[PDB]
Design a protein around this nucleic acid. Structure first.
Lengths: 372, 134, 63
RNA sequence: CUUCGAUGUCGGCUCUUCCUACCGUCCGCGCGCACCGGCGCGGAAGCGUCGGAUUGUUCACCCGUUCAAGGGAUCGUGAGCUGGGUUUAGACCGUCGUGAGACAGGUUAGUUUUACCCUACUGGCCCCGGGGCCAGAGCACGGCGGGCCAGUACGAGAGGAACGCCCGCCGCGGGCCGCCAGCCCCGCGGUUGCCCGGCCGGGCAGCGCCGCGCCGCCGCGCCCGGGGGCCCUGCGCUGACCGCCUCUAAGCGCGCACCCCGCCUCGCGCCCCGCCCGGCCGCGCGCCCCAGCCCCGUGCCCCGUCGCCGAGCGGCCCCCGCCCGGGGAGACCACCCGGCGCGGCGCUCCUGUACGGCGCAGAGCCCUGCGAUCGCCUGAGGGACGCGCCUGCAGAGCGCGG
RNA sequence: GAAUGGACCAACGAGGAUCCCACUGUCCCGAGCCGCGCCUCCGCGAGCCUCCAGCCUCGGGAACGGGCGAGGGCCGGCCAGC
RNA sequence: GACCGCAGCAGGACUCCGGGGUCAGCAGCCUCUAGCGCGGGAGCGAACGCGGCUCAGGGAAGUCGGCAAGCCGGCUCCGUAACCUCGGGAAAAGGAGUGGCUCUGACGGCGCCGGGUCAGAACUGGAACGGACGCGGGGAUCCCGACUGUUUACUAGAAAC
């Protein structure tokens, strides 16, 4: 017989399997559309979630009540130290999909990249690229291989490496990420632009703009084995249920005679790859600038970013939230399709008070005067 | 009869709540029968926020004419804290409401105590009648 | 920026932080934190809580 | 008919799926379609079909609201639950019976046993570089309103649209923690009884109790969800058969909340590169069109049957550590990191002003003896699992694979 | 329907009903926590079941099959859940 | 602590003697004497379970039904209705106070020495006091049985006897 009372299924089945992510960090999966003859630009950047602050903004959205009004909105700081470009991969679109022609690496790769290539750098034999550095550094090899990319590739990407030494992270190995070069008049314009960046730092200020929307891509916070009520959102049964109230009471009907994939079951909650899309960039700035958040106030919270560190160097504040806990790597891409009706940013205040405890002082100097 | 597109605020008064009278209409306490504009979900008690028109019945405390009838009302004060988009988190000492027709006219001449801006913006008569918008 | 003072604590509350409470008397009492608020609701005099400005002013400590 | 050496027996709760004989939303077309509405029809199962009073009830009925289709899954759903219904033994009442008892009349009280196996499902694992690419599999945004249009078309009035654009909301989905609530592992304060002789500081009352509370979880908070393709049901275009007419028979256009694809979630394999750059194998390329079919209705017909070099192309195989310590990760593993860490020092925050000394405080008693409390030193003391530092001890196997 | 006792409830009741006030995680709508179990390890170690076998969809058949017909899946071995 | 139940089984077994403190208490909580460290230990801090906590706003809307939980509670003083067999109801319902100090009063034997209860007042402490503990939620009615009693050991404590 029927359920008797219409109610939706609890859960999205396009986020199945709900398994711990096998991919090491957030991966981009897809990249923004190439677009012919656009201005040449880099599609993504890798960053590390630092914290959240809350900003006062003047909202110019006509038709909203908050038009010419003031709003306090949550914003997430993601630390983005410059990334060294180390290689240039070209992919030819073929009947079988994009198949890489070749990846040409720089004559000198920095130690953080090499560290990624070995499990323990100290006990490693350190043989990676040993013959390649000799074959390269003559100049001729790179050009002949780059020529192969110009003739037989359509999708040129730059392989970049984050610098973990400029971060409060304990990593010491560079996250290596491919970033697509989009907007070239010809393929040869993209490879030539890439060669200018080879072995050289790329910064968020060049990659993104304030007011633009970005798709954060990251692995989420993990809660381990979790029950159906927490994992899928099923209703706890009445308090008198023998065997407990924290379960789905019927996992199916007599027919079909096997439990279905759509029936909620206990298992891993958290540590799943998720992309958050259409998040507008409130600001891109450097923590070396003493007045970045002053409208002296620099980006460092008084007391420091809880569970993160010092955010030294370049940072980007996106509006809203990003998947993942603090410290976690987040790949950030140009929005695939952006929310057209988003108001332009007018930050009038950024909170710099302690997020460790309930601080009432924006700066350490204010606290020093208060406690005279 | 509400004027404008309200931004969503936390609803602290579910069905069964007995909100107090904020008017001299003669009711002392109003029980919340139901909430207007409500498409619910299974098992979810209808819930209401300040500035939201609700259907109420007046208890034995009220004058006899007011009693025994489902009457329209607007919640003008809620104990539950709610966040205006400006970031202010505001709450009032008591949960109270004004008997009003859906058109907007109010049964009682006077409104007592502070009344939330959410009620006053949505319903103009509430703004004029209430002494304070807080 | 723009600030308000706790009605109980009298310490400045920066934008976006705190709760505001509207009394039946029609007074509005902005509160710094749940501690600034719970002390008031429990009817504990601010002039007897040492951290509160009213005690510091009473002892001559602040003004 | 099949089950009586047993297939647990109604409704509810919880949960998934499925159907269309479609109520609303979508697309057309028809009305006794002015508009608003209603109403009939074809396609359409994506979403929605809710909160309650009485009843064990499905149903019924009524109240309400974003106004509320119908069903299937062993009359879906008991080693899931409930026992309210039903159907044992106690007991009433009415009827019936000489009686024992009966009731397909009412009433009340009445053990709901078992997974550690197999399968399925859900996650987890079976050492083997970094980046990626895509077979297959999953799949997710609907509904409602406000504003401008517009008191406009339309109605000779009452009334009263629309496309578009914009803003919100509901229900859902995926996250998050800046705020604001919850919670607090051993923080700080208060206090009761008993104990450590009193004070200080403790312990016990299985966290004695109460007030706050950090990191972290969390919702009651916050953020995010704007697209393409072929096309039904059809409406049209040119246009016949059928000396006409005609959306159709050739030909063509547009076309649905449906479907397929994208985005998203998983991903066997493969790819490129790095280390390494080594073997092994195969021997063979015009294209179109069939109412021009441009000269056809052949050819190959021997992969050993004598063919096997090289060249060039197309392949194929090879190849790549753990223990240990921490985590932002965890049942175990795995993952992600790694000369950790341990102890200090600052900063920040948490509590709320430490012990002691002092006094021109103190109801007093009385006697320079006691006295709860009080102010001062004292935003003090204590505390920290966050941030910065290391000035101190430390810290990378000659352990096992290779 | 009147000692197969009729009507009547003061006081009593682990009796059967309906309501009201206070009260609350009963619920909306769940969340955080503390123990102990679980889980992993060292040592000990059973029960109950059991023709075999151990993935499905449809068909036909004691009319509802794991084996049979025809399709569609599936290295093999385990763990915690259910 | 060896009995009797499969056993060296949270099952069942009749007595005697019975300190202190808080207290009305042979209650609860803590202890002196005496006894004493229970079919083992380690690690971890998943789900789920069991034993407990706490929860914003609402307050039974949940459910067959308020099941379970919560609320109330000690003492002192006020203040108590309908009904009623005049005995009750009744702790009705409903209030208020309560600590620590510093002192006052009263109450006896009769040179002088008890007693620990009762009042009354200052003065104090984040607006706090039965501070743990122990410890009625109340009310309006309906049925049935007058009551206290008894009952199917091992599913019916009832209106049955």
């Amino acid at each position: 017989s029927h359920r008797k009372f219409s109610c939706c299924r609890k859960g999205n089945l396009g986020y199945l399997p709900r398994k711990r992510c096998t991919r090491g960090r957030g991966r981009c999966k897809t990249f923004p559309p190439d677009v012919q003859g656009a201005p040449i630009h880099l599609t993504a950047f890798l960053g590390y979630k630092a914290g959240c602050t809350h900003v006062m903004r003047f909202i110019d959205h006509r038709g909203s009540n908050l038009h010419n009004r003031q709003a306090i909105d949550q914003a997430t700081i993601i630390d983005a130290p410059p990334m060294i470009c180390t290689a240039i991969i070209g992919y030819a679109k073929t009947p079988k999909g994009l198949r890489a022609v070749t990846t040409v690496w720089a004559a000198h790769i920095a130690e953080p990249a090499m560290r990624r290539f070995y499990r323990n750098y100290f006990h490693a034999e350190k043989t990676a690229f040993s013959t390649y550095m000799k074959k390269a550094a003559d100049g001729t090899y790179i050009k002949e291989q780059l020529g192969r990319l110009k003739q037989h590739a359509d999708v040129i990407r730059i392989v970049a490496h984050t610098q973990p030494a400029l971060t409060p992270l304990k990593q010491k190995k560079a996250d290596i990420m491919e970033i697509q070069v989009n907007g070239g008049a010809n393929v040869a314009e993209k490879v030539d632009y890439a060669y200018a960046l080879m072995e050289k730092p790329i910064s968020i200020k060049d990659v993104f703009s304030v007011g633009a929307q970005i798709d954060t891509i990251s692995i989420t916070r993990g809660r381990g084995f979790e029950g159906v009520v927490t994992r899928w959102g099923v209703t706890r049964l009445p308090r008198k249920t023998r065997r407990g109230n924290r379960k789905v009471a019927c996992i199916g009907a007599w027919h079909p005679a096997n439990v279905q994939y759509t029936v909620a079951r206990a298992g891993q909650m958290g540590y799943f790859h998720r992309t958050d899309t259409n998040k507008q960039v409130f600001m891109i700035d450097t923590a070396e600038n003493p007045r970045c958040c002053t409208t002296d106030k620099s980006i460092n919270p008084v007391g420091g970013f809880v569970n993160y560190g010092r955010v030294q160097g370049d940072f980007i504040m996106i509006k809203g939230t990003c998947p993942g806990p603090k410290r976690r790597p987040v790949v950030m891409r140009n929005a695939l399709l952006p929310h057209r009706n988003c108001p332009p940013v007018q930050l009038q205040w950024i909170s710099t008070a302690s997020k460790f405890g309930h601080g009432i002082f924006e700066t350490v100097e204010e606290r020093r005067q208060f406690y005279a | 009869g509400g004027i404008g597109n309200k931004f969503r605020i936390s609803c602290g008064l579910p069905v069964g709540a007995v909100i107090n009278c904020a008017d001299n209409s003669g009711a002392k306490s109003l029980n919340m029968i139901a909430v207007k504009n409500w498409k619910g979900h299974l098992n979810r008690f209808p819930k209401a926020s300040v500035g939201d028109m609700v259907l109420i019945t007046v208890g034995r405390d009220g004058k006899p004419e007011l009693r025994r009838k489902v009457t329209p009302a607007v919640v003008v004060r809620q104990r539950k804290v709610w966040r205006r988009k400006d970031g202010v988190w505001i709450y009032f000492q008591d949960n109270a409401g004004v008997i009003i027709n859906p058109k907007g006219e109010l049964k009682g001449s006077s409104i007592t105590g502070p009344v939330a801006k959410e009620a006053a913006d949505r319903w103009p008569k509430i703004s004029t009648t209430a002494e304070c918008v807080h | 920026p723009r600030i308000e003072h706790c009605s109980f604590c009298s310490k400045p509350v920066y934008p976006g932080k705190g709760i505001c409470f509207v009394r039946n008397d029609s007074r509005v009492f902005r509160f710094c934190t749940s501690k600034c608020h719970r002390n008031f609701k429990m009817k504990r005099n601010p002039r007897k809580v040492r951290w509160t400005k009213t005690y510091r002013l009473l002892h001559n400590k602040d003004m």
